[PDB]
Design a protein around this ligand. Structure first.
Ligand SMILES: Nc1nc2c(ncn2[C@@H]2O[C@H](COP(=O)(O)CP(=O)(O)OP(=O)(O)O)[C@@H](O)[C@H]2O)c(=O)[nH]1
Ligand SMILES: Nc1nc2c(ncn2[C@@H]2O[C@H](COP(=O)(O)OP(=O)(O)OP(=O)(O)O)[C@@H](O)[C@H]2O)c(=O)[nH]1
Ligand SMILES: Nc1ncnc2c1ncn2[C@@H]1O[C@H](COP(=O)(O)OP(=O)(O)NP(=O)(O)O)[C@@H](O)[C@H]1O
Ligand SMILES: [Mg+2]
Lengths: 426, 428, 328
């Protein structure tokens, strides 16, 4: 009944900072560790994301890893940093320089040992571990390499536990460093095997959402990460509270896996509206559905209407009846029958938690798996084949001792993944 | 002469809440457990308190402990609210085989204890689903065990059938079929109900726009009450569950009746009409009030039973029976000359505080074994077909220890069942 | 030019512990016409079937000899041992039985090794050297036999741009004399046993993998090479869901899942009827390491062994159905 959090690489680290802030505000926890809430329901399931320490204090089941001290110092200097206990801030004093080979293969093992020790200790301090959730980058060095190594090791230690993760995928239009496709490929090759499922989010789509739909002109990392955190909180708000149905992760896992190998998902969150328009709208089930279905609200940089949906799960927050939401989903499945696969009747599954998010009377999160996402993997392959053809700056990675064979195998596996998505697509 | 209550799966435990609220309100039992004032549902202590002969079981604690924190926490004994620590996650292998076999023992012991407390066990009721994980496999396992230990005792069940349109699990076909095998194997009389039909009924005849599970569950509780308290409380012509086995079973396999209730009327709709027995009896057979997404007119009828609550004179019952016999296109199979059973109780139906049904001076519940139900099966099978067409999701079950051979044999068994309904439907 | 993979079926002879306990050969072997019936009408067609007591050299000269021949075809040949626990597969490929009393104790492995060496005793013209690899997989993790131990992450599969299987991290031992062969096989068994965890009772827990590697390039240049595999999968204890229960049940569930994965793979060959797309190979290790063994220009045969009783009659049906569509 307890889940352990893991954040690697500056991106995922501050993302989880925002996320823990969200959860703390949820359960009414002060930035000092004292409880200040209104309902016992904030406390009833506090175990899922906290342990208890004397003085009525609560510790997040948190572990922070990096290769640079300043990032950890920054997140510690931010609000709710004191809520963390310093016993978990594990880090080196040398960056990986965006080198998967450096982070995963050679330099990482040092911090890997200690962090794995901490994982063991914290897990066994709890009663019944449910699973793990990760937050890191796929184009950078640390959050990719050490993330992969650590998740592999944990899966070795716990063969049957729930392994889910959120990882940011690069986009051609926001690419930062040339080594992006290589890290992407290796991270993907490891995730597709050592993990049960994954979520894909891109700064491009986030930029679009905050820019247009929130009518914001100066989008900071804060709001993008804020939305990601809202999604992550939604995906488990069902578990954290009494509800009607489907509060569990493994439930969603077996619901969303039409085949073992195809476990990539795009998330979506609603309602999202700039404050200027919030005086107009009427938050109902049809409105929420029209928001979530629209490709303009997909956290992944892929227009689903080019592919067809395989599986869809929708979780709702607030006081709502069943009949409305189910007939709404039925109508949705009807009007857009082209974007669904006949393989499964009723491609949509639902879940309803009884607690609304603070500020909105109701809300909705959506998770989808459709072959359309395969196009983004082309964004890797081509770029990959664009550089690997010339062996462009391959020398950096050869130095750490990784062979061409590994890139070759990863590329072949990615090809296989694309081919299987195209198989099931028709 | 006592009964046992079992609630497995989330729908089951919600049903339990509903029916127990209804009971305590039927007999002035304040939610504290006290009754400042009918002991087949409750065992009584010398303190003036009463305990319901019931058990609640599900592998995920949340709903159970919610019950433990609701109003009625003092009505139940902590020995009863048995819970696991990891749910079945919509997987027959997990609930039936992988996990539930680690809770089955304690609940079995509690059932056996409740039996020893009872003097004459007339039978028990079961409530669960065909779609959810916990309420699917674990239920099959428990039924298997009880059929080994007790046997001749009556085994009554209420399965919440997954609707063709409204659905909550990708594997609803799988769980449904795997449970269908076992309920053919060991159940006695199945009253499967669909959500959609209840939705239509309430949105049209009860006049609600936004039906919540509370309303459907209150309806189902009303149903089971009119079924059993009609005999536990005194009446005119008590017709026991054993007479149910006699009447509603034309053959050891044709034991799948459908349940219907009337009237379903709002407060305002209650006036602007005076309700005779004739009108309600006519209403009982319209498909718009049938609790299964199925067409009775299309199918043919084999057996029918009507139980009444309130003020009823047998002569008007005879009149209405003659009208129904002569008017409708109800094809009674020649293998039945007359399959009408009638039961009358004097206890008027009670209204739940804050409920959605107006108080009526007389009400009817109708049970009917008819071939039309076969329709529904085909749908699932066809749906199941497509899934088994690619063996999607099957990894999750072999990954938990099931055999595709079991899928095949289960499909063949369900095919045998529906084809047998077709055959016995064939007149000579 | 792919000749569809040939099939071969042998039946195991019963033990009195079943002979006097209601077990009888409900099946009906017919080796002359090459077919097997079950019950009274389930005549199935196999171009090669075997008796219940055909010698190890008998089954050898039956099927292995064409494989020893085509070993120099410059294209890989393979064979797999399929079926249930206690189904003689260890005895079928004839290994892990080191007594040398009558050479019917040990079968395919030592016989094939000796015959290969004797074919080397006569021809030593070109540049052609052969080594071997002999590992195990269990709990979907790798553990070599020739190696005493190594973390899973090291020993790995690899796929070249040419699209061929490669194995990294495994310990390599080249073969030069048959004594070396027998000793290494003995120690490999003795450092794995019926399984990684030896077994409850001495029969078929894990999946044992082996490979003979000899290059005879297309004639310093065009490297057209034929290799060979000795793969013995574990048992398929299906009806014993009521049997192995608890920790042993979890032990067996993973191998069961892998077997069903392989069955799903092989199924999609003779069934392109509805949208005949590509084959899902990379799902599991076994499927990966055998992908090369199917289609294209690689040569392969198969062997299955069932029990005479109608206890696992259903499992006989399953095996027969799987081996039926084994065309290509
Ligand atoms: N949506 C957001 N994306 C971010 C944010 N900060 C960084 N990023 C993305 O993540 C990438 C950089 O993240 P990291 O520094 O954690 C990559 P990594 O740590 O593995 O490299 P090293 O630190 O050199 O080891 C960068 O390309 C950004 O596109 C943020 O606040 N929000
Ligand atoms: N009649 C009725 N049916 C319900 C209710 N809640 C859920 N269901 C049905 O049961 C299915 C979902 O199962 P739940 O009972 O919500 O969940 P569960 O299987 O009990 O437990 P989990 O699977 O662990 O959530 C849906 O397909 C619904 O049709 C309810 O309050 N009343
Ligand atoms: N065809 C056969 N010839 C000789 N002995 C056999 C035969 N079939 C079964 N046996 C005997 O029955 C036992 C079961 O066979 P076994 O050698 O365990 O193969 P298995 O059950 O497939 N397990 P393993 O091969 O070790 O994975 C063996 O000890 C053999 O001695
Ligand atoms: Mg970084």
């Amino acid at each position: 009944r307890e889940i352990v959090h893991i954040q690697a690489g500056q991106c995922g680290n501050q993302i989880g900072a925002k996320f823990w802030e969200v959860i703390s505000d949820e359960h009414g926890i002060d930035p000092t560790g004292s409880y200040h809430g209104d309902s016992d329901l904030q406390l009833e399931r506090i175990n899922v994301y906290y342990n208890e320490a004397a003085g009525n204090k609560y510790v997040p089941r948190a572990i922070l890893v990096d290769l640079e001290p300043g990032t950890m110092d920054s997140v510690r200097s931010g609000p709710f940093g004191q809520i963390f206990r310093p016993d978990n801030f594990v880090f080196g004093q040398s960056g990986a320089g965006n080198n998967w080979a450096k982070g995963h293969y050679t330099e990482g093992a040092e911090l890997v040992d200690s962090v794995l020790d901490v994982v063991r200790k914290e897990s066994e301090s709890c009663d019944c571990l449910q699973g793990f959730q990760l937050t890191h980058s796929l184009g950078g060095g640390t959050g990719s390499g050490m993330g992969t190594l650590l998740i592999s090791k944990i899966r070795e230690e716990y063969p049957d536990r729930i392994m889910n993760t959120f990882s940011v995928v690069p986009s051609p239009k926001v690419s930062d460093t040339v080594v992006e496709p290589y890290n992407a490929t290796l991270s993907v090759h490891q995730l597709v095997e050592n993990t049960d499922e994954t979520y894909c989010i891109d700064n491009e789509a986030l930029y679009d959402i905050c820019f247009r739909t929130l009518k914001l002109t100066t989008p900071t990392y804060g709001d993008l990460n804020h939305l990601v955190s809202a999604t992550m909180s939604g995906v488990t708000t069902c578990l954290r509270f009494p509800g009607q149905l489907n509060a569990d992760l493994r439930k969603l896992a077996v619901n969303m896996v039409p085949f073992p190998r195809l476990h990539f998902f795009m998330p979506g969150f609603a309602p999202l509206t700039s404050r200027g328009s919030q005086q107009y709208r009427a938050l109902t089930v049809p409105e929420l559905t029209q928001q979530m279905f629209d490709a303009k609200n997909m956290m992944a940089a892929c227009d689903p209407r080019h592919g067809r949906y395989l599986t869809v799960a929708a979780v709702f927050r607030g006081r709502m009846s069943m009949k409305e939401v189910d007939e709404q989903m039925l109508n949705v499945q009807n009007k857009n029958s082209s974007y669904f696969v006949e393989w499964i009747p009723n491609n949509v599954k639902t879940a309803v938690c009884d607690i609304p998010p603070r500020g909105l009377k109701m809300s909705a999160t959506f998770i989808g798996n459709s072959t359309a996402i395969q196009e983004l993997f082309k964004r890797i392959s081509e770029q990959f084949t664009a550089m690997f053809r010339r062996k462009a700056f391959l020398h950096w990675y050869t130095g750490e001792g990784m062979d061409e064979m590994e890139f070759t195998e990863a590329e072949s596996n990615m090809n296989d993944l694309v081919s299987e998505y195209q198989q099931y697509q028709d | 002469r006592e009964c046992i209550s079992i609630h497995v799966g989330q729908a089951g435990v919600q049903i339990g809440n509903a029916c127990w609220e209804l009971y305590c309100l039927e007999h002035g039992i304040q939610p504290d457990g006290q009754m400042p004032s009918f002991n087949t549902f409750f065992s009584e202590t010398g303190a003036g308190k009463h305990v319901p002969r019931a058990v609640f079981v599900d592998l995920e604690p949340t709903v159970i402990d919610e019950v433990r924190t609701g109003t009625y926490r003092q009505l139940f004994h902590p020995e009863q609210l048995i819970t696991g620590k990891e749910d079945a996650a919509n997987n027959y292998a997990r609930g039936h085989y992988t996990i539930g076999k680690e809770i089955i023992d304690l609940v079995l012991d509690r059932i056996r204890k409740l039996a020893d407390q009872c003097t004459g066990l007339q039978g028990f009721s079961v409530f669960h689903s065909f779609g959810g994980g916990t309420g699917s496999g674990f239920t099959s396992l428990l039924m298997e065990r009880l059929s080994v230990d007790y046997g001749k005792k009556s085994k009554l069940e209420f399965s919440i059938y997954p609707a063709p349109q409204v659905s909550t699990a990708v594997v609803e076909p799988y769980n449904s079929i795997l449970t269908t095998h076992t309920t053919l194997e060991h159940s006695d009389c199945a009253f499967m109900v669909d959500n959609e039909a209840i939705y239509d009924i309430c949105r049209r005849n009860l006049d609600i726009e936004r039906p919540t599970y509370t309303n459907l569950n209150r309806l189902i509780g009303q149903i089971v009450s009119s079924i059993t308290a009609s005999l536990r409380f005194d009446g005119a012509l008590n017709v026991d569950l054993t007479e149910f086995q006699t009447n509603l079973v034309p053959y050891p396999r044709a034991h799948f009746p459908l349940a219907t209730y009337a009237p379903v009327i709002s407060a305002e709709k209650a006036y602007h009409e005076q309700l005779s027995v004739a009108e309600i009896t006519n209403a009982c057979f319209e498909p718009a009030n049938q609790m299964v997404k199925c067409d009775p007119r299309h199918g043919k009828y084999m057996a029918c039973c009507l139980l009444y609550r309130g003020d009823v004179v047998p002569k008007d019952v005879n009149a209405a029976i003659a009208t129904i016999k002569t008017k409708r296109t109800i094809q009674f199979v020649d293998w039945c000359p007359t399959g009408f059973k009638v039961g009358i109780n004097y206890e008027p139906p009670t209204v739940v505080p804050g409920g959605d049904l107006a108080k009526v001076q007389r009400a009817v519940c109708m049970l009917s074994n008819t071939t039309a139900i076969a329709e529904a099966w085909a749908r699932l099978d066809h749906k199941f077909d497509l899934m088994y067409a690619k063996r999607a999701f099957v990894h999750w079950y072999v990954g938990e220890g099931m055999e595709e051979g079991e899928f095949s044999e289960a499909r063949e068994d369900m095919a045998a069942l529906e084809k047998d309904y077709e055959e016995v439907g064939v007149d000579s | 030019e792919e000749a569809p993979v040939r099939v071969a079926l042998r039946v195991r002879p019963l033990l009195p512990k079943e002979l006097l306990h209601g077990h009888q050969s409900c099946l009906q072997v017919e080796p002359g016409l090459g077919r097997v019936t079950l019950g009274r009408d389930r005549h199935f067609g196999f171009h090669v079937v075997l008796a219940e007591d055909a010698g190890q050299e008998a089954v050898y000269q039956a099927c292995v000899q064409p494989l020893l021949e085509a070993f120099f075809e410059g294209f890989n040949a393979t064979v797999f041992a399929y079926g249930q626990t206690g189904s003689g597969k260890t005895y079928t490929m004839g290994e892990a039985s080191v007594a040398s009393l009558l050479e019917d104790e040990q079968g395919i492995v030592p016989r094939a090794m000796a015959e290969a060496f004797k074919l080397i005793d006569e021809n030593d013209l070109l540049d052609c050297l052969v080594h071997v690899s002999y590992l195990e997989v269990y709990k979907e993790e790798f553990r070599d036999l020739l190696e005493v131990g190594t973390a899973s992450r090291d020993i790995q599969l690899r796929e070249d741009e040419r699209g061929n299987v490669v194995l990294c991290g495994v310990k390599e031992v080249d073969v030069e004399g048959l004594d070396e062969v027998l000793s290494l096989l003995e120690m490999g068994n003795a450092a794995r046993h019926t399984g990684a965890t030896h077994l409850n009772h001495l029969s078929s827990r894990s999946h044992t993998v082996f490979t003979v590697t000899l290059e005879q390039r297309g004639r310093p240049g065009q490297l057209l090479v034929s290799k060979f595999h000795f793969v013995d999968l574990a048992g398929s204890e299906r009806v014993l869901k009521t049997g192995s229960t608890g920790e042993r049940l979890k032990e067996s569930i993973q191998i069961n899942s892998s077997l069903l994965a392989l069955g799903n793979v092989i199924s999609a060959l003779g069934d392109p009827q509805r949208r005949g797309s590509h084959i899902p190979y990379r799902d599991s290790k076994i499927t990966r390491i055998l992908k090369d063994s199917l289609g294209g220009n690689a040569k392969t045969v198969m062997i299955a062994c069932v029990s005479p009783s109608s206890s696992d009659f259903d499992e006989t049906l399953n095996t027969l159905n799987y081996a039926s569509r084994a065309q290509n």
